Each structure stands twice: as C-alpha cells, then as structure tokens.
From Swiss-Prot, chain B:
Gene3D superfamilies: 14-3-3 domain. The keyword Cytoplasm applies. Interacts with SERK1 in the cell membrane. Component of the SERK1 signaling complex, composed of KAPP, CDC48A, GRF6 or GRF7, SERK1, SERK2, SERK3/BAK1 and BRI1. Interacts with TPK1. Interacts with ADF1. Binds to CRPK1 at the plasma membrane. Interacts with DREB1A and DREB1B in the nucleus when activated by CRPK1-mediated phosphorylation upon freezing. Interacts with CINV1. Binds to the N-terminal region of B1L. This is 14-3-3-like protein G-BOX factor 14 lambda. The gene is GRF6. It comes from Arabidopsis thaliana. GO terms for biological process: brassinosteroid mediated signaling pathway; positive regulation of protein catabolic process; response to cold; response to freezing.
Length: 248, 247
C-alpha cells in the first residue's frame, strides 16, 4: 500500500502515459483508503472523474462504431456477419457495465458518504447520474427504463441541492444542467424539456456573470458555450412534443 | 472456434473499433489454425502485422513518456518519486516483453515454417528482427546484448535472402534495409554503418526506379523518402529525434 500523496503521483503518471485503466486503479485505491472518513481534495476529485471519463469514453466510442456496423450489416441481410457483430457488441457492453458498476459502487459506498458540503454532493450525485445515463445508452427496455429512472433520481437530487446552495455560475452546477438536459434530449426524447432546462441554467449564469472569478471562468464559460451549442443544435432540429455535447 | 474467413472479419471488426489487443487474438488464432500446413494470404499477413504494430506502438510510446519522466525526477534528486517511476516503467517493460514474445513465438513456431517463398520469408524474418529490436530498446546490460544479437541474426538472414531473390525496389526489401539501418544507429550507435546501409539501398533502388511503374512507385518511393529522412536526421545529428522505421 502506498500513501495518499503517492497515489496522486501514480495517477498523474498513468495519465501522462495514457494508461487510464491503471489511472482508475490508482485513484480507487486512494478513495477506498481515505474515504468516507475524510473528503477528497478538488485535485483528487477531478483525477478520479478524468480517469473514469477516459476509460468509459473509449468504450462508448467503440460501442458507437460497433453498433453502427451492426446496422450496416443488418441492412445487407448478411445474417452471418450480424451474428458475429452482435457477439462483439455484447462484449463491449459487458465492459461498459463493468466500468459503470465500478464507479457507481464507489459513489454509494465511499464518495457520497464523504461529501460534507453541497458542492461535493452535487458533484458525486451528478457523477452518479452520468454513469447511470451511460448505462441507459446501450440498454434496451426495462433495463433502460430502470437506468433512466436511476438517472432521473441522481440528477434531480443534485439539481435540488445545487439550486439552493450552489451559484448558477459554478461549473459543477452548470455541468449538472448540461448533462441533465442531454439526458432528457437523448434518453427521454424530450427536446422541449431539455431546451427549457439548458436555457434556464444559461440565463441564470449570465445574470450573475459579473461575480465570476479567475479560478472557474473558463470552466464555466466553456460549459455555457456547450449549453448554447446544444441548444442551437436542438432548436435547429425540430422535435414533436415532449450526438449532443456533455460536460467536460 | 471460428473459421479462417470469420477470424478475418473479427480482426477487421476489432480494427475499426480500435480494440487492437483483441485484433491480435483474432489473428493469433487464425495463424495457429491455418499454418504451417498452408501460408497466410497477403491480407491475413498484413492484418497480423498491423495488429501487433499498434499494440507494441502504444506501449513503446508510453515507455518513452515514462522513461522521460524518470530522467527528470532523477535530475531533481527526488529519490522517492524516482523509485516510484521505475516500478511503473518496469511494469510497462514487462508488458512490452509479453507482446514481443507473443509474436516472436508465433514467428518461430508457425509463420516462418509456413513461408514457402522468399518474399514471405523476408517479410517474416524482417518482422522477427523488428520485435527483437523493440526488446533491445528498453533492455539493458546482459539482456540487451542478447536482444541485439538476436536482432542481427534475423535481419542478416532476411538481407541474405532479400539481396538474392528480391528486387532492390521492393518495399519489403527497402523496409528491411530501413529498419536494419535504424538498428545500427539506435541500438549499436554505428552512425557510419547505418548511413552506408541506408544510402546503398536508396542507390540500388533509384538505379532500378525508372523501370518501376506507378503501381508501386508510391510504395518504393515512400520508404525511399524515409531512408533519406533518417539520413538527413543522422547527418544533422553528427553536427554536435527517433528514426523513421518502416510502415
């Protein structure tokens, strides 16, 4: 076993080598060894989030490609290749599930219990909704509806806490509104609800934009632009009743 | 167990998804089931080469980064951080060793025996030397010399066959001379021999490049352009980067 400061060094070392599967292991060991008794630092909090974002991001990108090839093979009526491709996609899906379960388990057992402030709660609850949403991207029915309900619970909990204590210009609250609006748009097909949410968070940040500090102005404004980009792509598109840019 | 044609489809599928560790496995099983009784098709032979190239390239890239991190830490005399980085580098080295052994074992047990033509023999022998050279990159001391010796034998064997049966404009023979010259410059620090070897291959090829058509002109000239890129880098290096190996 290494020290807390040493796992941060090993996580960064793995980050430089783009060996993210091991960056996750180094941060998990840091988490399980310092929480829930104590709270993660902003640095450790972001290193963990970055580690899982890259690991799952790589599998999400692969799943898109495989799923796309499957549709291309089913349009050819190539029954042979369709059988092989679906075997492969399920292998990627089991790995997507493995990673989401890892962080979701760490969120319930360690991270959320460790949050002793609204900022940390909203961060981990948002994160909890994020990886439930990733589960909902490849699940079919029932499993997807369950994945969607778990997403709704985690996000709406983070939204309640954030709106009451977080500032509308805080990147975490902004990122929450972004990913939450992506949830309505891409998981629930509610363009109207998703646009109304993104716009509200955007305008709320504009009103208090003067009181935005050096530390988080780029993080905030970046999310603000992603909200505006999505809102343009969504309003440019046209739904009927009821990829998008998620947070950094 | 799947069929030969299907392993090709799965290897191609893994390549599209950029899941190269699996692309290797699909081809490994294709090889162990089809050879040495028969020989790999050019397609299969290339799918195998690409799969291992990406896997070992990814680790070689990480090893350069980690190895670079270690040096800086030592320059500051952190001591603690230094011991941590080496333990991490040694983990990447064990993986590099695992990959190379995988293809090297596949070469000596299945692929080289299957080669019933000089072109294939030189392709598989040139590959054997490539992955012994990758061992020599991170090995040190006693283990390094053994790796450098194994590289010399694979390349020299491929060169003997190539110079006798392959044309000096053939991309495989040009790539061999390219990687074989990089071996002398990077591993053995023989700046002169690496240059003499590169120039010879580039001279022997241009002397026959006129009679070469536009079908493989891009193939030959591309490796030729790499032979001179290294040869320009090396000359400037003697005016006191990583050499361009073959595609």
């Amino acid at each position: 076993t290494l020290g807390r400061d040493q796992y941060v060094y090993m996580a960064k070392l793995a980050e430089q080598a783009e060996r993210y599967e091991e960056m996750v292991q180094f941060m998990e060991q840091l988490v399980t060894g310092a929480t829930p008794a104590e709270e993660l630092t902003v640095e450790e909090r972001n290193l963990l989030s970055v580690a899982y974002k890259n690991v799952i991001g790589s599998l999400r990108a692969a799943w898109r490609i495989v799923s796309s090839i499957e549709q291309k093979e089913e349009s050819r009526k190539n029954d042979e290749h369709v059988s092989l491709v679906k075997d492969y996609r399920s292998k990627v899906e089991s790995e997507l599930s493995s990673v989401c379960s890892g962080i979701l388990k760490l969120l319930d057992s360690h991270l959320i219990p460790s949050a002793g402030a609204s900022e940390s709660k909203v961060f981990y609850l948002k994160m909890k909704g994020d990886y439930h949403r990733y589960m909902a991207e490849f699940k079919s029915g029932d499993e997807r509806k369950t994945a969607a309900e778990d997403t709704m619970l985690a996000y709406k909990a983070a939204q309640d806490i954030a709106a009451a204590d977080m500032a509308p210009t805080h990147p975490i609250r902004l990122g929450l509104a972004l990913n939450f609006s992506v949830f309505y748009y891409e998981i629930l097909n509610s363009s109207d609800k998703a646009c109304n949410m993104a716009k509200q968070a955007f305008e709320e940040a504009i009103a208090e934009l003067d009181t935005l500090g050096e530390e988080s102005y780029k993080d905030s404004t970046l999310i603000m632009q992603l909200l505006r980009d999505n809102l343009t792509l969504w309003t440019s598109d046209m739904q009927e009743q009821m990829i998008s840019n998620s947070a950094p």
